[PDB]
Structure 1
Amino acid sequence: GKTTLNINIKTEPFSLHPGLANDSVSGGVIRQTFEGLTRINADGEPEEGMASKIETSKDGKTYTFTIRDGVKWSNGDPVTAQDFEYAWKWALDPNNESQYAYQLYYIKGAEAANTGKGSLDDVAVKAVNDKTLKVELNNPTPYFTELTAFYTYMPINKKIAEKNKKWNTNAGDDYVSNGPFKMTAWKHSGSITLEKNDQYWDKDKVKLKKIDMVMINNNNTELKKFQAGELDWAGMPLGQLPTESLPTLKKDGSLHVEPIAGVYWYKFNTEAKPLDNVNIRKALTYSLDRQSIVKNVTQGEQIPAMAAVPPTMKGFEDNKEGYFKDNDVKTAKEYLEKGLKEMGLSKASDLPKIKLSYNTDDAHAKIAQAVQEMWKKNLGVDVELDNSEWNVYIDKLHSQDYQIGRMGWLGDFNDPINFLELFRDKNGGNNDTGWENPEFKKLLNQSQTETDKTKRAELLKKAEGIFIDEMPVAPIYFYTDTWVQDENLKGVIMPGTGEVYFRNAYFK
């Protein structure tokens, strides 16, 4: 069985600093090259990683991590509690402009430090000694060992980071990592090579020696390379199949199709006219024919989304039907008319220019062209399209330099709030819409203190209801992962949240 794995990651990562990464491309790499206090096992549950033992206080708020004996970076240096402390505080430092700082707000003092209302010293992550990390949360958080497996909670080599502020931007002596693989090459916009890391504590269970990740943003070509034997995988999570090929691949029985905790949505910049008008947002959302899109455009067995939280998330199964009606043109026309009245306008032709944006990808263009048609036919609303390379695109949305913007969101841990708290705060890193609601916030925060699971769930549903009512985003569909593979590739870890770990993968 061969020991090299050839896959497409489509495009240049946003960042291979674990504290700046906020995307599937970045995460696809880092998830191979770093390891947190915990990692995800085959059954999608957290288990011990860099921490050999985890202790939680009686009150549930204080976690004490014992750092495994002998764990090392890829240059041989020990991994220490200090490395974690530094990483986490680095991500929270507002100067470093992590879009995922809010992911660390579960730690006491984290939000204050990040917002400028408090000292980084008072963030309650503490390297007590080299082998002991002590963490105090604002509230008992039963998924915290999921968060510590998430890439924002990765350690970085403190010594090298302090020496070279740009360590993360190139492969080389200054790029070191603690995961089952290490990155031995990175040609920007070309590819990345990972190799088994001989310093990783659990290296005896790692079978691959090399992973070549190419950067082909062309779905057709990915499948050709796969059909030629030059890739061992074609499609998601890291690549993509061309939509016209899914008929065939379903018919020959090769295609894998899996529902995942993820949502495809069109984000509105609620601070840019005319998307600042809630009525216009609703008219654009309600006038969508999502069943058409998932049957006729994407053809990947996606489920129409009329909600934020995927119905895989237990307690939220009835988001299958969602908060409103799909292809509800009557209601959309009502909203349009109301919003038109508020502007002193009679006809939708006289709205200001609207540009709908997405990241370069034939699949996203096909969806955008369908939606553009829906708006023209159903509302009389003209929109012009544009596309950008992924990493630039992420900054375009984060900086609100857009009106409507395609985005997709996969769960970072198995809790419904991951689909909600990204909109808690106006300048949240992953919000992008400029929206916030006081009641929405209050309920989110109340959910984090509620000890009964069903009552908590109701708070989140309430919150979701307010969200959908103000429509800062337009839900389109809940995700699937579709791919074909060399069926000799065994042991790949793919949890319901739609990521992939190659740590224990092999060819038989």
Structure 2
Amino acid sequence: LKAGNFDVAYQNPDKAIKGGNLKVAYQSDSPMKAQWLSGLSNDATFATMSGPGGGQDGLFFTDSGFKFIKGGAADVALDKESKTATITLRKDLKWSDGSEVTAKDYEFTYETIANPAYGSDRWTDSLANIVGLSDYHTGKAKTISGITFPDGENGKVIKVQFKEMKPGMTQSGNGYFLETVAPYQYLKDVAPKDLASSPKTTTKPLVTGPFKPENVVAGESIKYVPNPYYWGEKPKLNSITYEVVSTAKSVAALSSSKYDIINGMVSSQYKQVKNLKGYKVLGQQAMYISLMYYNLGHYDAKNSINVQDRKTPLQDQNVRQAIGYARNVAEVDNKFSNGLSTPANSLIPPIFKQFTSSSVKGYEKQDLDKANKLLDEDGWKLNKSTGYREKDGKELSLVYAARVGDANAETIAQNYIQQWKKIGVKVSLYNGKLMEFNSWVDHMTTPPGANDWDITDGSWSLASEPSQQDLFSAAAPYNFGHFNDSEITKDLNDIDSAKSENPTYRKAAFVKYQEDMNKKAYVIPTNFMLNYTPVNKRVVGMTLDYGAMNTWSEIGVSS
């Protein structure tokens, strides 16, 4: 398995010893916030650090494309005809204290999120598709009517009844049903308003994973030890320590071999890491897309609809395409990215092999000739005097709301401005400088939208169900440029249709959608990215493969 030039796995030539201690860090300049219940946890640092303990008690295995498979802590089965997900917990699925994981523990997850008394931030509208769940969430019902227990609360089976099935229900991270358990017998006497701050969910939790946390130092670290009651394969290691390390100390920690693995390192430090003797640097395709938006309308919040009514030359498809073909994204990546940004051909990242294809062509190759011809054949005629194009007497001049974020953000934005000058388009920065991120978010997300930018960049960390509805549909507030296109709406609906329960049909629908988006060019894909992880050469069985389900049990050290 490769990811760009990177290996996905470190194939250690040496055999693992029995036992050993693995030293893992997560790069963060902020303290971790320990919260073992998925529904109550809002800190990405700790979510990742919870890995050895079960990742906040996730139930389901997937393949490398995040499609559910059987054989994890539980199985999930979908039945179209009865509109039901059936969750079957393993007979020997236990909490770390030896107590049984039961149907009630699965249902209780739902209460931690949907009952506002616990203070979760994780309710989504998607959950309203479970029968009875909205009524629970608003306090109209004392129980969740769509969740039933064929063999009782102390049984191992849970049925979840939906109003409508969705084809994304076979992908982890779909959000239509939840994928974690909570130890109801351990927590049932804690007041909901006190659950998040209780020892029992912070320093002294029950877990289901291959390791349990023997010690938690708040903000800093976890000492993991084998969980005797884990249903699966007993781990090789005697322990794992998992700590936060600051950005400024990460490279030195590798130099001294303080950590066997550091997770979450940022793209800029890669040049300092690549050279380090004693480490293998692994890479993996990220669940990430960056793209360029054009401002084409406004958002009507009252009616929840994007209206594509902005006066701008970007209403012309030829202009949108030309501005895309003019960029030198490949060249930019080659100068600056260390192979960690690679040009996007489409809106769906290539890690989703079941939902995209490299055969989709976008704007990944600069074509200044094509850009110039497009503007020509559309009446944007160049000047002698100025080097810029005019049409019905008005100059082709646009505002670029570029933003701070990338370590060469200023240099990249200027490079694009210069490329656009080559095709006779005059582009200037919004207020003559890069936008701060919080400014940029406010500008793009406050309805009805501003009229004072033409081009901007966005970048998303995608869930493992790569839903496009929430980003680009006619009703989406995140449709930042406010396009509204009947063909794209049809394409989006087809992706989520009953016909798309068939994987081959769904792939085709995703592919058509990506083609249509590139042609229409309301937005332009910019980059995919790779994540990297340095791994000490003594570690055995380490891999970034998303389909690797037992890495914490398999991983060992050679000395």
TM-score normalized with structure 2 length:
0.66
Deviations 1:383-432 (A, max 9, x none): 4335569xx9999987789984553435515xxxx152442657769877
Alignment partner of 1:380 is 2:427: yes
Amino acid at match of 1:423: L
| CA displacement at 1:152 relative to structure 2 | 5.3
Structure 1 CA distance for aligned equivalents of residues 293 and 106 of structure 2: 33
Q: Rate the CA distance shift 1:48–1:203 in 2: closer, same or farther, 3 A.
A: closer
Deviations 1:207-240 (A, max 9, x none): 352332314234xx42221121112124x55665
Q: Rate the CA distance shift 1:112–1:468 in 2: closer, same or farther, 3 A.
A: farther
Structure 1 CA distance for aligned equivalents of residues 477 and 96 of structure 2: 31
Structure 1 CA distance for aligned equivalents of residues 541 and 523 of structure 2: 37
Structure 1 CA distance for aligned equivalents of residues 171 and 113 of structure 2: 18
Deviations 1:135-167 (A, max 9, x none): 245337586374589995222345469724364
Structure 2 CA distance for aligned equivalents of residues 182 and 323 of structure 1: 47
| CA displacement at 1:173 relative to structure 2 | 3.0
Work out which of the residue numbers 224, 231, 242 in structure 2 matches 1:195.
Answer: 224
Structure 2 CA distance for aligned equivalents of residues 467 and 111 of structure 1: 35
Q: Rate the CA distance shift 1:336–1:122 in 2: closer, same or farther, 3 A.
A: farther
SS in 2 for 1:309: coil
Alignment partner of 1:488 is 2:538: yes
Q: Which residue is equivalent to 2:12? A: none
Q: Rate the CA distance shift 1:30–1:419 in 2: closer, same or farther, 3 A.
A: farther
Structure 2 CA distance for aligned equivalents of residues 286 and 429 of structure 1: 27
Segments of structure 1 that go 5 or more residues without pairing to the other structure are 359-363
Q: Rate the CA distance shift 1:2–1:397 in 2: closer, same or farther, 3 A.
A: farther
Q: Which residue is equivalent to 2:362? A: 323
Q: Rate the CA distance shift 1:442–1:160 in 2: closer, same or farther, 3 A.
A: farther
Structure 1 CA distance for aligned equivalents of residues 550 and 29 of structure 2: 17
Q: Which residue is equivalent to 2:28? A: 10
Q: Rate the CA distance shift 1:71–1:211 in 2: closer, same or farther, 3 A.
A: same
Q: Rate the CA distance shift 1:449–1:430 in 2: closer, same or farther, 3 A.
A: same
| CA displacement at 1:296 relative to structure 2 | 1.4
Q: Rate the CA distance shift 1:442–1:99 in 2: closer, same or farther, 3 A.
A: farther
Structure 1 CA distance for aligned equivalents of residues 394 and 40 of structure 2: 43
Alignment partner of 1:80 is 2:130: no
| CA displacement at 1:295 relative to structure 2 | 1.5
Which moves more between the two structures, 304-313 or 41-50? 41-50
Alignment partner of 1:348 is 2:397: yes
Amino acid at match of 2:542: V
Structure 1 CA distance for aligned equivalents of residues 200 and 255 of structure 2: 36
| CA displacement at 1:293 relative to structure 2 | 2.6
Work out which of the residue numbers 179, 191, 213 in structure 1 matches 2:243.
Answer: 213
Structure 1 CA distance for aligned equivalents of residues 294 and 342 of structure 2: 21
Structure 1 CA distance for aligned equivalents of residues 503 and 486 of structure 2: 23
Work out which of the residue numbers 329, 335, 339 in structure 2 matches 1:300.
Answer: 339
Residue pair 2:283, 2:544 contacting (<8 A) in 1 also: no
| CA displacement at 1:291 relative to structure 2 | 0.9
Structure 1 CA distance for aligned equivalents of residues 46 and 489 of structure 2: 29
Amino acid at match of 2:535: Q
Structure 1 CA distance for aligned equivalents of residues 104 and 488 of structure 2: 36
Alignment partner of 1:173 is 2:185: no
Residue pair 2:293, 2:457 contacting (<8 A) in 1 also: yes
Structure 2 CA distance for aligned equivalents of residues 202 and 405 of structure 1: 46
Segments of structure 2 that go 5 or more residues without pairing to the other structure are 1-18, 300-307, 382-388, 421-425
Deviations 1:164-204 (A, max 9, x none): 43644x6833333524245543644xx33252363652376
Larger of the two Rg values belongs to structure: 2
| CA displacement at 1:285 relative to structure 2 | 4.8
Superposition map of 1:203-352 within 5 A: 205-206=234-235, 207=237, 209-218=239-248, 221-234=249-262, 242-245=269-272, 248=275, 254-259=280-285, 262-265=288-291, 285-300=324-339, 302-314=341-353, 318-319=357-358, 322-324=361-363, 326-329=365-368, 331=371, 334=375, 346=395, 348=397, 351=399
Amino acid at match of 1:409: S
Which moves more between the two structures, 261-270 or 172-181? 261-270
SS in 1 for 2:38: coil
Alignment partner of 1:135 is 2:163: no
Larger helix fraction of residues: 1
Q: Which has the higher contact order (CA 8 A, sep 6+)?
A: 2
Q: Rate the CA distance shift 1:298–1:87 in 2: closer, same or farther, 3 A.
A: same
Q: Rate the CA distance shift 1:48–1:210 in 2: closer, same or farther, 3 A.
A: same
Residue pair 1:39, 1:47 contacting (<8 A) in 2 also: yes
Residue pair 1:259, 1:302 contacting (<8 A) in 2 also: no
Amino acid at match of 1:348: S
Q: Rate the CA distance shift 1:393–1:60 in 2: closer, same or farther, 3 A.
A: farther
Alignment partner of 1:67 is 2:89: yes
Residue pair 2:265, 2:533 contacting (<8 A) in 1 also: no
| CA displacement at 1:486 relative to structure 2 | 0.8
Q: Rate the CA distance shift 1:467–1:76 in 2: closer, same or farther, 3 A.
A: farther
Structure 1 CA distance for aligned equivalents of residues 407 and 242 of structure 2: 28
Amino acid at match of 1:65: I
Q: Which residue is equivalent to 1:361? A: none
Q: Rate the CA distance shift 1:457–1:145 in 2: closer, same or farther, 3 A.
A: closer
Pairs aligned (count): 484
Q: Rate the CA distance shift 1:6–1:246 in 2: closer, same or farther, 3 A.
A: closer
SS in 1 for 2:201: coil
